[model samples]
Every structure is written in structure tokens, then in C-alpha cells.
Target: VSVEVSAEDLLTCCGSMCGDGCNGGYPAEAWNFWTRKGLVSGGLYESHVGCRPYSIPPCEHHVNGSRPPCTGEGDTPKCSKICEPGYSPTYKQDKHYGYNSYSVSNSEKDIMAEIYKNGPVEGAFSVYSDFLLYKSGVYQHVTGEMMGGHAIRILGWGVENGTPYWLVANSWNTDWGDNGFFKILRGQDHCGIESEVVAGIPRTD
Candidate 1:
């Protein structure tokens, strides 16, 4: 008799890629280790089934003059990097989108200003209207819901002249690029890029 094994079951029997936060760390060892162990077998079915969700308070929790932690799981305009609750990934077809370094690590942001000034990761959000350009690639946030997924950068943000703005990096291809970045509304109530403000910037090379 032949037993049928679901795709997820097969992956769970294997493993997924483990690495540093979003875009840094010694990923080579972690990736190779998990690969040898059979965690990342090429797709989301295996990636999701093999990995687990982790919770960490956004950097805001530790910084002064910063946004507070987004603890409530509500139908808000967006969710914190910590992914508080009520938000489910709307467009990701796989689990890897939300796992393994989803949030931009604290260290990476330290040098963000330089990254922006230098080029490649430079951009900013609006402190005024929610005139968000609904282009094809920017992940659409479900109305009044908190969601998480996709690895992006917090390019440049500031309270220039009182109003706040966030310059964020995106993984979506440049086709939907807002100059290769997107500008989301910034303020006390806005949760999308709050954690980024807290991380400050990385030490840099």
C-alpha cells in the first residue's frame, strides 16, 4: 500500500533556512546548516511548515522620544514590525515572506542615513496626506488591519520642520518602485514604520 504525503508534511520532516535578522548576520552558516538539515527545500510549503514565528518588541520599547510599542491586536490602519495582531499577510504566496529576519535589524538602521545619502536605499514617506500611490507592487495593507511580511529598509525619516516622514525600502521589484522606495504616512498613530525609527542606525563599516 502507498501512503500519500502532503507537501507540508514532507517539508516539516525536513527544515527551513535559519539566518540573521532581515538583511544581516552570518547567514552562510545558518543557511548551510538548515540546508543540510533539509529545512529549505525550495518553496514556501516547506519553508512555512518547517519554521516557527518569533515575537520581539519593536526597538521603540527601548528608545526615548520614540513611538510606543504596538501591543494591541486591532483593526488598525497597519501593524507593527512585531506584527501585533489582526493583520494577516495579504499577498505573500509563501511562508518565507514573514519568517527569518522580517524586521530590519537594529544594527542595519544605524547606517541607514548613510545608506540613503550614498544611494541605492534613499527615500522617504509623507508626513502630510495619505496620498499613497497604489502601485502594483507595494504590499497592500488590509484596511484597519495589522499585517507583516516582506523585508524592507527604513531609508530616511525625520521630523523636519515638525512633520514626520518615513523613507522605506521595499523588496518589490523596481517596476512598482517609488524611486525604488515608498513613502508611508508617519506620526504617533501610524504603526507601519515605527519600529524603524527606534532602531536608529547601524555602526557601519
Candidate 2:
């Protein structure tokens, strides 16, 4: 069976400490923050229950359809905690919803195996101008200038047109990219997608 975790929850739970919000961040740092501080159960993109209640807005067409800064100050809002009364169990400080994270190899086989065994893993890759035009099929970074590193959740892998690709869940809205998700050529580490990967094991009682 395939496993998929909430990329938005990860962001809402650890966005402020993991790294800069919206701008970009490191998956490793997010994992570290989760391990240290723990996390609160978060809702989907627009659930006003857990952590993030607002979903990421579509990329504004600025120069090439890239997203605008969070604020004119080039800064983002701090992460918010939204635990409600009687909706979810209230855990003690150490028992807050969280998990233990660890680094995984960049190898395709290793990444696939880990996802199959555990769950979704975090992936960080460089976004290029060409990526802004992605519509469908396996993404290979055809052309364009380097934008910056962006993070996403790799749920699983599949082959399309005999091309191996990693199924990733992006925070961007459904209006952007392949319905808020994209596939990148796997095994070869296209665009450094396999370079920095991290997975978390949920902590349970």
C-alpha cells in the first residue's frame, strides 16, 4: 500500500522554526524541529481546526508565474496553533502530536523502500523558471534559470511512458501545476530531488 502524509500540516506545525515560511526551507531542519518541539495535529489546506487553516494561494504571475513574497517585508507570518476544545484530545507537553525523523539515502531504491515501509518523506529540490510552466508528464527540468530550493512531500513513485517519476504533493493550490502535485524523473536525482530527503516515524502510545 502507498502512504501519503499532509505536507501542509508539516508546514503549519514547523514552518516558523523549520525555516523561513513561503520563501523556502530545509526538510532536515523541519524534522529536527519536530523532534525537539513536537507537533500538533493539523488540518488539511483550509481546515480551521488543527494547525494551518489556510491553503497556499496560487502563484501570482510575477515575471514568470512565481509566487510573490509572503509580505512586502519579505517576511512570513508566524506558525499558529489551533487546538480546539473537545474536538481533539489534549496531550501533555511531551505527548503532543509529533514524530521522530531521520535522514534517508538519496538512492531511488532506498527512497522507495522507505516510503513503502514508513510513509511520506520530505523532499527539497531546486525550482527553475521552466518548472513554472509544468502541466503534466514526468518533470525533468527542461530549461530555465534556477529559482531556489523548495520543499514538498514525496508520497510514492510510479512510471509514466516508461519514465520513472516520484509522486510529490505540493503546497501550491490545485490551480497550479498538476493539481497541486508533480512528478519528477526519479533514480537520476533530477534537479537534486533525491539529494536532500528526510522521513518521519510518527510517535504513538
Candidate 3:
């Protein structure tokens, strides 16, 4: 499986001793939106794997705000906001749209349909790939249900034995579900794994 790591994740993944500049996330637009909604909480201390900690403001105190800068090795960088205490996200709202909202909407679906319009999708078919397609600039469309109050990154998609599935990246650690990445049975419904269209595309940086 080709794993698509974020530019931030890739830098940190290779043991770079740099401060968490934006956690590799888009530092403008929508992040502010989530902060205003009390969705993003705080940052994670990515001490493990040599990730230095940095402060991103306008987050909730109890949620992501509680996490400290990572210290040693194994400390993963947490985001600013998290879903409510008992909810899990079916899709991730990314930077491309410049708005913070749930991925279970008609706009999200329309985003996906457009990308996949070119038959098996296009070069921009992001979240549809098996790796972190969103990180690479892609998103799939599917409505999600609010369960367990959680939010995560929509990574990519793939087919297992010819069955299509969406890949999710969770902050819950490798042992949580499907080894830090969960698989959603993709079709037309969101089972805590339903993703949406309109993910960011990799910019020519």
C-alpha cells in the first residue's frame, strides 16, 4: 500500500527536530472556523519521533488544548479541536474549502462526484487512493454519522478483495482500530467511516 504522508508528517516521520509548525495543517482559513465553533481544542506534544512542539492558538481548553508538546519519541502531535466526547467523524473537512464543517453534507458529496466524474476518477482523486490521499489532495463523498464524538483525517481509499473501502487516520494509536488507521465500508452511507468529496489537492509548493 502506498502510504501518503503529509509534508509535515513526512518531515517529522523521518525524525526531523523541527518545531510543529502548524502540525502540517493549513494554518489559515478554516482552522479559525473550527476554533470559533469550539471544535478544535489544542495541540499534541509530538515528543516521540523527534517532533518538536509548537503552539497553535484559538482552541478549546478541554479537548485538544489539554495536550502538551510532545517530548521524546512516540509523542504524536494532536490537533486543535476534537469532536464531542462521544462522536466519531465519518468524513474530514479539509483546507481546500476554507470552511469548518462536517463532511456529511450535500456539498461534500458533490465534491466527490466531481472528482470521480472522469471515469475511475482523475489525477486529483485524493481520498479515493489507498494512501493518505487527502494529504496528497483528494477527498471522497459519503455521509457520516455522529458516534462516540470523534474526528479524524480522511486518508485514502482502496479495494479489499474487490470491495471498495475508505482509509481513515485516527489519533487513537495503532492498537485502537485497524492499526491507527480505520477502514470504512464505502457505498452510499456513512458508518463512522463514510467520507466525502472535496479534499485538498497537493499544491505545487
Model 3: residue 97 alpha-carbon error in angstroms: 13
Model 1 lDDT per residue over 68-150, tens place = 54344322122112211332442122122112111232333443544565432322222222223344233333354322323
Kindly list the per-residue Cα lDDT of model 3 for residues 115-156, writing each as its tens digit: 454212111122322232222222343444322323355545
**Residue 150 shift from truth in candidate 3, angstroms:** 2.0
Q: Using alpha carbons, what is the TM-score of model 3?
A: 0.34
Candidate 1 regions off by >4 Å? 1-147, 158-163, 187-189, 196-205
Runs in model 3 deviating more than 4 A are 1-147, 192-205
lDDT winner between 1 and 2, please give it.
2
The most accurate candidate by lDDT is: 2
| Position 17, candidate 1: lDDT | 42
Assess each prediction's global lDDT (C-alpha) against the native: 0.33, 0.69, 0.34
Q: What is the lDDT of candidate 1?
A: 0.33
In candidate 2 the C-alpha lDDT for residue 100 amounts to 75
lDDT of 3 at 204: 24
Q: How many backbone clashes does candidate 2 have?
A: 0
